[PDB]
């Protein structure tokens, strides 16, 4: 329930700084490797919890081929952990392949919902 | 002959559960007898009938 605009704001302030990007990005990459969702054949945007209207609009607005790829990666992850194994090492999601694909859709749906709730509580300056 | 075995024991469910109940009957009886004989034999000289036969001699 942290909004992705907050995460993106803190993350962009980290990434555009010279000093703490070169400190904080290696510990993030080690965190990503130790997380081990890639060993199950999942990108990170398959991990975002989808039972909220923002993620439902983002998954509805996601294009058709990306949605089929996401559905296969989820079904393969369920089938993999059902057998208590991992995917073989040639089937792991590589680091250049782990892209944020759902993130622009989530960000525009979140900006639309925040603009909606700012306009619903608007006050004219009379 | 596994075919005749299947057709007389596992084909109909009625004879299947009848065999399960008959086996449970005889299993319960002889399993109780086997456990009680092993228990009384493992505790030899400690039981009351052993003590009673000792004090009756």
């Amino acid at each position: 329930p942290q909004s992705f605009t907050s995460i993106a704001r803190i993350g962009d302030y980290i990434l555009k700084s010279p000093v703490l990007s070169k400190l904080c990005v290696p510990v993030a990459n080690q965190f990503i490797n130790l997380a081990g969702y890639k060993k199950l054949g999942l990108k990170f945007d398959d991990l975002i919890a989808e039972e909220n209207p923002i993620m439902q609009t983002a998954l509805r607005r996601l294009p058709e081929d990306e949605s089929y790829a996401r559905a296969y990666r989820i079904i393969r992850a369920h089938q993999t952990e059902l057998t208590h194994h991992l995917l073989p090492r040639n089937e792991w999601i590589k680091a250049q392949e782990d892209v944020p694909y759902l993130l622009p859709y989530i960000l525009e749906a979140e900006a639309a919902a925040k603009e909606k709730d700012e306009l619903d509580n608007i006050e004219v300056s009379k | 002959s596994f075919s005749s075995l299947y057709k007389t024991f596992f084909k109909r469910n009625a004879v299947f559960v009848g065999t399960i109940f008959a086996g449970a009957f005889v299993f319960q009886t002889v399993f109780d007898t086997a456990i009680t004989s092993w228990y009384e034999n493992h505790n030899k000289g400690k039981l009351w009938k052993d003590v009673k036969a000792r004090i009756a001699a």
Partner: protein
């Protein structure tokens, strides 16, 4: 707190009923009933144990009939309403020495002897605590204790000062099977008898536990097989993905 007021811990003796297939040694229960009746029955009671529970465990029927008839219980009154006594039967409970708590506290200098029919389940230590307590009276209380009068030293008792003196001395009870009745022999037998008095279900409980553990481990392994059989189709399921042509 201090190990004095904790009490020294009783060590682990090799009881003949320790172990999951073991049974009470019934000859030692019979001898322990003799030790209770000739020494322990002067102060402690056994009012949870009926006479009929002894038949077929430590004595025969005639022996428990005679040991019950040597006592007097209250009968229902006569046709004139006066109270009447009765020789004991198998249905009655083992009587205690004192008629109330006040006679006990009067006869034992204030202290009350606990009822011994649950005392090995009521003390942390089990039979080892009872054995170490009965045999653990030093000849002298160690150098520097302020022992109050009427109290004795036993380090297994929490605090040290117990209001029960040493009551087990050698050859104070003759056994009718000729066992040499030392202090440790009598303490072993009376502790086995007290453990039977606390848990008279012990042997059948362990026998039923053998049957139950065998049947349940059979069922557990067999259910592991039946689960793996029913789940084989889902464990060995393969997924292929050909990306659809765009339209």
């Amino acid at each position: 707190m201090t190990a004095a007021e904790h009490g020294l811990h009783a060590p682990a003796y090799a009881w003949s009923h320790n172990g999951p297939f073991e049974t009470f040694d019934h000859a030692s229960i019979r001898r322990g009933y003799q030790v209770y009746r000739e020494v322990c029955a002067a102060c402690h009671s056994l009012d949870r144990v009926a006479w009929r529970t002894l038949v077929g465990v430590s004595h025969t029927n005639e022996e428990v009939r005679n040991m019950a008839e040597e006592f007097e219980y209250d009968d229902e009154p006569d046709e004139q309403g006066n109270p009447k006594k009765r020789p004991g039967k198998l249905s009655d409970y083992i009587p205690g020495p004192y008629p109330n708590e006040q006679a006990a506290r009067a006869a034992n200098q204030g202290a009350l002897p606990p009822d011994l029919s649950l005392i090995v389940k009521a003390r942390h230590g089990g039979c080892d605590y009872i054995f170490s307590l009965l045999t653990g009276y030093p000849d002298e209380p160690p150098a520097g204790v302020a022992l109050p009068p009427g109290s004795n030293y036993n380090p297994y008792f929490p605090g040290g000062s117990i209001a029960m003196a040493r009551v087990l001395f050698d050859d104070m009870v003759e056994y009718e099977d000729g066992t040499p009745a030392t202090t440790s022999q009598m303490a072993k037998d009376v502790t086995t008898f007290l453990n039977w008095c606390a848990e008279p279900e012990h042997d059948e409980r362990k026998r039923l536990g053998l049957k139950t553990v065998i049947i349940l481990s059979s069922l557990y392994l067999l259910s592991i097989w039946v689960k793996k059989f029913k789940w084989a189709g889902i464990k060995t399921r393969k997924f292929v993905f050909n990306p659809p042509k765009p339209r």
